[PDB]
Amino acid sequence: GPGFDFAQAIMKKNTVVARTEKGEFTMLGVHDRVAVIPTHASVGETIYINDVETKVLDACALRDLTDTNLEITIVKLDRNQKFRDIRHFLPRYEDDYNDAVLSVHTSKFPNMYIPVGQVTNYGFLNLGGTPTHRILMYNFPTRAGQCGGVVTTTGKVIGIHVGGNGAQGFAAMLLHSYFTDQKHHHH
Ligand SMILES: *[C@@H](CC(=O)OCC)[C@H](C[C@@H]1CCNC1=O)NC(=O)[C@@H](CC(=O)[C@@H](NC(=O)c1cc(C)on1)C(C)C)Cc1ccc(F)cc1
């Protein structure tokens, strides 16, 4: 069936509740003190992590070479815990997937799992009026409150939930090359 065991292990060790002025989001920690959150969360220079106020040391809203929103923001956080390194679970390329799980960790839903079915490489999405690329699509009625939710299949962390129209759900891709270790003035 769906990979519930895999999704649970990712939730246990690699998720936190993140809270900005836009609300609460599931936040996936990727490695060391680096995590991801939907760009719509509007991260500033501090963020609440599990209700603890935390300095945001770096924040990078990803865009592609067309200067189009990818809806992923990568954050570096000032906190003592290191995240388990899950980069080796990230896909190398764009792909479609079978029988994925969407996993939420918020104050309202401290852990909840939703089998979303098949996931297709959707591409372009007008996301609440912002053009966005690299989007994954599932036919599941996802809802407000699930943004940031982790999308997995066994062995792979493939996206974070960012949108939905009452019939389909949409995730922003996570690619392995987003998190590899030059000299760049990026602000
Ligand atoms: C998650 C965030 C949340 O709860 O509110 C953030 C303040 C939310 C999940 C969806 C809400 C309804 N169902 C969901 O799964 N994400 C959003 O609200 C983004 C906006 C949307 O999802 C819109 N949907 C679409 O634009 C759309 C287009 C198509 C083909 O299908 N759906 C609304 C109709 C909900 C938030 C967002 C992200 C990026 C932006 F630039 C603007 C807004």
Residue numbers in the entry: 1 to 181, 183 to 188
Quote what the paper states about this structure:
The Picornaviridae family of single-stranded, positive-sense, non-enveloped RNA viruses includes several pathogens of concern such as enterovirus-D68 (EV68). The 3C protease cleaves eight sites within the viral polyprotein, with a preference for a glutamine–glycine (QG) motif at the P1/P1′ positions, a preference distinct from host cysteine proteases. Among strains of EV68, the amino acid sequences of 3C protease and its cleavage sites are highly conserved. We have determined and analyzed three high-resolution inhibitor-bound crystal structures of EV68-3C protease, which revealed possible sites of resistance mutations, a key structural water molecule conserved during ligand binding, and the conformational flexibility of the catalytic histidine H40.
Rupintrivir demonstrated the highest potency with the IC50 value in the single-digit nanomolar range, followed closely by AG7404. From these data, the shared scaffold of rupintrivir/AG7404 appears to be well accommodated within the active site of EV68-3C protease. Within the active site, rupintrivir and AG7404 exhibited identical hydrogen bonds from P4 to P1′, with one additional hydrogen bond formed between AG7404 and C147 backbone nitrogen. The observed conformational flexibility of His40 was likely due to differences between inhibitor P2 moieties. At P2, AG7404 lacked the fluorinated phenylalanine ring of rupintrivir and was unable to pi-stack on the catalytic His40. As AG7404 is an analog of rupintrivir, this compound shares many structural similarities and protrudes in the same regions, highlighted at the S4 pocket, where the isoxazole ring forms the same hydrogen bond contact with Asn165. At the S4 pocket, the mutation of Asn165 into a larger residue could preclude binding of the inhibitors, while other mutations could remove the potential for hydrogen bond formation, potentially decreasing inhibitor binding. Furthermore, this additional hydrogen bond formation, not conserved in viral substrate interactions, has been implicated in resistance against rupintrivir in HRV-3C protease. While there are no sequences of circulating strains with mutations at these residues, mutations can emergence under repeat exposure to inhibitors. This concern is exemplified by previous studies that demonstrated a 7-fold (V104I) and 15-fold (N165T, A103V, and E3G) decrease in potency when mutations arise in HRV-3C protease against rupintrivir. From our structural analysis, we predict that EV68 strains with similar mutations would likely demonstrate some level of resistance toward these inhibitors.
